[PDB]
mmCIF file of C-alpha atoms in Angstrom:
data_model
loop_
_atom_site.group_PDB
_atom_site.id
_atom_site.type_symbol
_atom_site.label_atom_id
_atom_site.label_comp_id
_atom_site.label_asym_id
_atom_site.label_seq_id
_atom_site.Cartn_x
_atom_site.Cartn_y
_atom_site.Cartn_z
ATOM 1 C CA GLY A 20 255.132 7.142 66.512
ATOM 2 C CA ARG A 21 253.657 10.562 67.229
ATOM 3 C CA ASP A 22 252.508 12.220 64.031
ATOM 4 C CA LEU A 23 249.639 14.649 64.766
ATOM 5 C CA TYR A 24 251.404 17.415 62.839
ATOM 6 C CA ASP A 25 253.106 15.236 60.224
ATOM 7 C CA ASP A 26 252.353 15.936 56.563
ATOM 8 C CA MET A 27 222.643 38.706 69.183
ATOM 9 C CA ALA A 28 225.668 36.638 68.239
ATOM 10 C CA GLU A 29 225.645 34.468 65.111
ATOM 11 C CA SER A 30 227.868 31.458 64.492
ATOM 12 C CA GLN A 31 228.164 29.001 61.634
ATOM 13 C CA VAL A 32 228.913 25.505 62.975
ATOM 14 C CA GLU A 33 229.829 22.411 60.964
ATOM 15 C CA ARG A 34 229.296 18.887 62.288
ATOM 16 C CA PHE A 35 231.508 15.960 61.345
ATOM 17 C CA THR A 36 231.494 12.231 62.035
ATOM 18 C CA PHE A 37 234.576 10.431 63.397
ATOM 19 C CA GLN A 38 236.131 7.796 61.158
ATOM 20 C CA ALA A 39 234.789 4.423 62.356
ATOM 21 C CA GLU A 40 237.957 3.085 64.036
ATOM 22 C CA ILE A 41 238.626 6.455 65.728
ATOM 23 C CA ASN A 42 235.070 6.343 67.067
ATOM 24 C CA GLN A 43 235.745 2.809 68.352
ATOM 25 C CA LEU A 44 239.000 3.986 69.983
ATOM 26 C CA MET A 45 237.298 6.887 71.728
ATOM 27 C CA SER A 46 234.637 4.520 73.122
ATOM 28 C CA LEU A 47 237.362 2.102 74.278
ATOM 29 C CA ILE A 48 239.210 4.979 76.013
ATOM 30 C CA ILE A 49 236.059 6.304 77.684
ATOM 31 C CA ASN A 50 234.135 3.115 78.626
ATOM 32 C CA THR A 51 237.074 1.078 80.003
ATOM 33 C CA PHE A 52 238.818 1.383 83.372
ATOM 34 C CA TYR A 53 242.507 2.319 83.288
ATOM 35 C CA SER A 54 244.472 2.547 86.504
ATOM 36 C CA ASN A 55 247.169 4.962 85.325
ATOM 37 C CA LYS A 56 246.058 7.759 83.016
ATOM 38 C CA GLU A 57 249.176 9.992 83.212
ATOM 39 C CA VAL A 58 249.885 9.388 79.528
ATOM 40 C CA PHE A 59 247.294 12.079 78.698
ATOM 41 C CA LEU A 60 249.741 14.771 79.876
ATOM 42 C CA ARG A 61 252.703 13.188 78.142
ATOM 43 C CA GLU A 62 250.762 13.301 74.850
ATOM 44 C CA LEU A 63 249.607 16.904 75.302
ATOM 45 C CA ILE A 64 253.185 18.048 75.847
ATOM 46 C CA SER A 65 254.724 15.900 73.123
ATOM 47 C CA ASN A 66 252.172 16.999 70.525
ATOM 48 C CA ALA A 67 252.835 20.626 71.482
ATOM 49 C CA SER A 68 256.567 20.018 71.031
ATOM 50 C CA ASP A 69 255.943 18.548 67.551
ATOM 51 C CA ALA A 70 253.932 21.640 66.603
ATOM 52 C CA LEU A 71 256.700 23.899 67.862
ATOM 53 C CA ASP A 72 259.331 21.920 65.928
ATOM 54 C CA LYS A 73 257.274 22.203 62.745
ATOM 55 C CA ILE A 74 257.069 25.994 62.831
ATOM 56 C CA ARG A 75 260.657 26.367 64.096
ATOM 57 C CA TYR A 76 262.008 24.313 61.186
ATOM 58 C CA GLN A 77 259.756 26.184 58.728
ATOM 59 C CA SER A 78 261.321 29.394 60.080
ATOM 60 C CA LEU A 79 264.808 28.173 59.078
ATOM 61 C CA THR A 80 263.863 28.369 55.423
ATOM 62 C CA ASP A 81 261.233 31.159 55.744
ATOM 63 C CA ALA A 82 261.940 33.519 58.668
ATOM 64 C CA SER A 83 258.724 35.546 58.186
ATOM 65 C CA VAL A 84 256.545 32.702 59.514
ATOM 66 C CA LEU A 85 257.216 33.759 63.120
ATOM 67 C CA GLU A 86 255.846 37.311 62.713
ATOM 68 C CA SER A 87 252.428 36.124 63.977
ATOM 69 C CA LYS A 88 253.974 35.196 67.376
ATOM 70 C CA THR A 89 257.701 35.299 67.913
ATOM 71 C CA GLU A 90 257.793 33.170 71.085
ATOM 72 C CA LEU A 91 258.073 29.374 70.873
ATOM 73 C CA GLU A 92 256.673 28.206 74.191
ATOM 74 C CA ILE A 93 254.192 26.123 76.149
ATOM 75 C CA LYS A 94 251.752 27.317 78.833
ATOM 76 C CA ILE A 95 249.871 24.938 81.159
ATOM 77 C CA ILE A 96 246.895 26.207 83.174
ATOM 78 C CA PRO A 97 245.128 24.009 85.737
ATOM 79 C CA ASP A 98 241.899 25.723 86.829
ATOM 80 C CA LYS A 99 240.019 24.036 89.668
ATOM 81 C CA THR A 100 236.974 26.374 89.597
ATOM 82 C CA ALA A 101 236.474 25.820 85.875
ATOM 83 C CA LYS A 102 237.421 22.103 86.230
ATOM 84 C CA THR A 103 239.743 22.444 83.229
ATOM 85 C CA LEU A 104 243.342 21.799 82.287
ATOM 86 C CA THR A 105 244.528 23.957 79.384
ATOM 87 C CA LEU A 106 247.723 23.571 77.375
ATOM 88 C CA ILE A 107 248.681 26.317 74.956
ATOM 89 C CA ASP A 108 251.521 26.100 72.441
ATOM 90 C CA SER A 109 252.757 28.672 69.942
ATOM 91 C CA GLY A 110 253.495 25.976 67.374
ATOM 92 C CA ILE A 111 252.385 25.761 63.766
ATOM 93 C CA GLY A 112 248.643 25.571 64.488
ATOM 94 C CA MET A 113 245.978 23.923 62.347
ATOM 95 C CA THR A 114 243.815 25.366 59.599
ATOM 96 C CA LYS A 115 240.139 24.350 59.589
ATOM 97 C CA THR A 116 240.794 21.550 57.112
ATOM 98 C CA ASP A 117 243.860 20.422 59.109
ATOM 99 C CA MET A 118 241.463 19.995 62.074
ATOM 100 C CA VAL A 119 238.869 18.191 59.969
ATOM 101 C CA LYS A 120 241.440 15.722 58.658
ATOM 102 C CA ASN A 121 243.775 15.332 61.611
ATOM 103 C CA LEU A 122 241.220 15.440 64.451
ATOM 104 C CA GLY A 123 238.886 12.742 63.374
ATOM 105 C CA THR A 124 237.633 12.235 59.814
ATOM 106 C CA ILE A 125 240.634 10.531 58.178
ATOM 107 C CA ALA A 126 241.714 7.015 59.128
ATOM 108 C CA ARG A 127 244.985 6.587 61.004
ATOM 109 C CA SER A 128 247.248 3.644 60.132
ATOM 110 C CA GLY A 129 247.685 2.391 63.717
ATOM 111 C CA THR A 130 244.197 2.620 65.191
ATOM 112 C CA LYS A 131 242.986 -0.949 64.567
ATOM 113 C CA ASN A 132 246.248 -2.565 65.596
ATOM 114 C CA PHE A 133 246.427 -0.441 68.769
ATOM 115 C CA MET A 134 242.943 -1.535 69.813
ATOM 116 C CA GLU A 135 243.814 -5.187 69.146
ATOM 117 C CA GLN A 136 246.899 -4.889 71.328
ATOM 118 C CA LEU A 137 244.939 -3.210 74.156
ATOM 119 C CA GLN A 138 242.393 -6.024 74.089
ATOM 120 C CA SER A 139 245.071 -8.732 74.072
ATOM 121 C CA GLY A 140 247.492 -7.276 76.628
ATOM 122 C CA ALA A 141 250.297 -6.731 74.081
ATOM 123 C CA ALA A 142 250.071 -2.978 74.730
ATOM 124 C CA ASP A 143 248.821 -0.819 77.544
ATOM 125 C CA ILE A 144 247.259 2.622 77.378
ATOM 126 C CA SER A 145 250.618 4.325 78.144
ATOM 127 C CA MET A 146 251.832 3.220 74.689
ATOM 128 C CA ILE A 147 249.106 5.042 72.751
ATOM 129 C CA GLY A 148 251.583 7.632 71.401
ATOM 130 C CA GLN A 149 253.547 4.908 69.579
ATOM 131 C CA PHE A 150 250.478 4.167 67.449
ATOM 132 C CA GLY A 151 249.913 7.728 66.198
ATOM 133 C CA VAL A 152 246.628 8.260 68.043
ATOM 134 C CA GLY A 153 247.936 9.922 71.221
ATOM 135 C CA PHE A 154 245.638 12.958 70.901
ATOM 136 C CA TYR A 155 242.687 10.805 71.945
ATOM 137 C CA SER A 156 244.278 10.045 75.327
ATOM 138 C CA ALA A 157 242.733 13.356 76.469
ATOM 139 C CA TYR A 158 239.451 11.412 76.802
ATOM 140 C CA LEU A 159 240.966 9.317 79.587
ATOM 141 C CA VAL A 160 240.541 12.294 81.912
ATOM 142 C CA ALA A 161 238.154 14.680 80.102
ATOM 143 C CA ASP A 162 234.447 14.466 79.235
ATOM 144 C CA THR A 163 234.817 17.233 76.624
ATOM 145 C CA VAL A 164 237.872 18.441 74.739
ATOM 146 C CA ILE A 165 238.008 21.816 73.000
ATOM 147 C CA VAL A 166 240.800 22.637 70.521
ATOM 148 C CA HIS A 167 241.322 26.266 69.520
ATOM 149 C CA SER A 168 243.893 26.669 66.744
ATOM 150 C CA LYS A 169 245.422 29.368 64.586
ATOM 151 C CA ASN A 170 247.713 28.616 61.641
ATOM 152 C CA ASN A 171 249.286 31.384 59.571
ATOM 153 C CA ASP A 172 247.278 30.165 56.536
ATOM 154 C CA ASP A 173 243.792 30.499 58.104
ATOM 155 C CA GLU A 174 241.570 32.221 60.653
ATOM 156 C CA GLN A 175 241.269 30.913 64.216
ATOM 157 C CA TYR A 176 238.938 27.911 64.560
ATOM 158 C CA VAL A 177 237.560 25.885 67.410
ATOM 159 C CA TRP A 178 236.950 22.121 67.345
ATOM 160 C CA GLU A 179 234.848 20.500 70.046
ATOM 161 C CA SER A 180 233.845 16.979 70.968
ATOM 162 C CA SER A 181 232.266 15.130 73.852
ATOM 163 C CA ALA A 182 232.732 11.908 71.833
ATOM 164 C CA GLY A 183 229.466 10.152 70.896
ATOM 165 C CA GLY A 184 230.708 9.819 67.320
ATOM 166 C CA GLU A 185 230.757 13.487 66.313
ATOM 167 C CA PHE A 186 232.659 16.737 66.529
ATOM 168 C CA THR A 187 232.010 20.321 65.515
ATOM 169 C CA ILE A 188 234.152 23.104 64.059
ATOM 170 C CA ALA A 189 233.397 26.849 64.009
ATOM 171 C CA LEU A 190 235.171 30.158 63.596
ATOM 172 C CA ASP A 191 236.600 31.158 66.960
ATOM 173 C CA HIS A 192 236.130 34.736 68.161
ATOM 174 C CA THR A 193 237.494 34.102 71.666
ATOM 175 C CA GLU A 194 240.990 35.229 72.727
ATOM 176 C CA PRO A 195 243.243 35.402 69.632
ATOM 177 C CA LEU A 196 246.180 33.005 69.870
ATOM 178 C CA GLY A 197 248.322 34.800 67.299
ATOM 179 C CA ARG A 198 249.602 31.380 66.217
ATOM 180 C CA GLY A 199 249.355 27.917 67.737
ATOM 181 C CA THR A 200 246.926 25.681 69.599
ATOM 182 C CA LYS A 201 245.034 25.844 72.889
ATOM 183 C CA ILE A 202 243.569 22.542 74.098
ATOM 184 C CA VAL A 203 241.075 22.683 76.956
ATOM 185 C CA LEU A 204 240.230 19.498 78.855
ATOM 186 C CA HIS A 205 236.960 19.584 80.785
ATOM 187 C CA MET A 206 238.000 17.195 83.496
ATOM 188 C CA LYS A 207 235.914 14.259 84.675
ATOM 189 C CA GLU A 208 234.872 14.441 88.329
ATOM 190 C CA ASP A 209 236.970 11.396 89.280
ATOM 191 C CA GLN A 210 240.093 12.882 87.610
ATOM 192 C CA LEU A 211 240.162 16.286 89.320
ATOM 193 C CA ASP A 212 243.283 15.339 91.329
ATOM 194 C CA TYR A 213 245.281 16.119 88.170
ATOM 195 C CA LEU A 214 244.574 19.796 88.848
ATOM 196 C CA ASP A 215 246.254 19.728 92.278
ATOM 197 C CA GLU A 216 249.254 22.058 92.308
ATOM 198 C CA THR A 217 251.978 19.579 93.362
ATOM 199 C CA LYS A 218 250.480 16.734 91.323
ATOM 200 C CA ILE A 219 250.436 18.643 88.050
ATOM 201 C CA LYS A 220 253.848 20.258 88.713
ATOM 202 C CA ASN A 221 255.400 16.811 89.207
ATOM 203 C CA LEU A 222 253.676 15.366 86.170
ATOM 204 C CA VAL A 223 254.873 18.253 83.979
ATOM 205 C CA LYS A 224 258.446 17.775 85.251
ATOM 206 C CA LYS A 225 258.261 14.013 84.696
ATOM 207 C CA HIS A 226 256.957 14.320 81.138
ATOM 208 C CA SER A 227 259.124 17.182 79.853
ATOM 209 C CA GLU A 228 262.774 16.073 80.429
ATOM 210 C CA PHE A 229 263.718 16.275 76.737
ATOM 211 C CA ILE A 230 261.372 19.108 75.737
ATOM 212 C CA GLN A 231 263.416 21.897 74.144
ATOM 213 C CA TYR A 232 260.869 24.701 74.672
ATOM 214 C CA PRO A 233 260.107 26.794 77.777
ATOM 215 C CA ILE A 234 257.098 25.719 79.843
ATOM 216 C CA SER A 235 255.123 28.098 82.065
ATOM 217 C CA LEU A 236 252.888 26.427 84.668
ATOM 218 C CA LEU A 237 250.154 28.504 86.335
ATOM 219 C CA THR A 238 248.480 28.025 89.693
ATOM 220 C CA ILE A 239 245.177 29.851 90.177
ATOM 221 C CA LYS A 240 244.689 31.196 93.719
#
């Protein structure tokens, strides 16, 4: 059901509006109480794995695609001072238009039906990935989500949203990724426990049993 990757300083920033049902979903995720929000980490890792698969399989038929970053790996960085959780993958990455389309402007087939099932009790929040909208689970635990991405076909871009119906995209001149995606979750005050060393270690272990890529987990001292 996961399909995110399926087929003086001056800055130019473009603003976009979320597709109506995606906007509704984000509001539902933010303005409703959920007891168990661990799915957010499952989705971060699984989406990273999909991105890694996509570039790995593209490399079978075109080996040159890995020249931008030869490693296929995941890095997870909890940072209590910054109040952020970051997950970096060296997967396929997203061009600017990939971000525009896949991170909010284009309708997703499962959004309406997912929201109906949440309202009824037929589904719970842990099942979000099955409905192809798992990315948005980040808003269970984060006020703001920032997505830096670099695809071989484009320059590095950064997408940002604090919900409220809109997102922005701009050229990204921060640390070059080489290739892949860095997602930064600015954690809500009441969700900071997810940055605790043992808590995040256990969660990563729990949600990576079948992941076929190396994971590096940092602790900041």
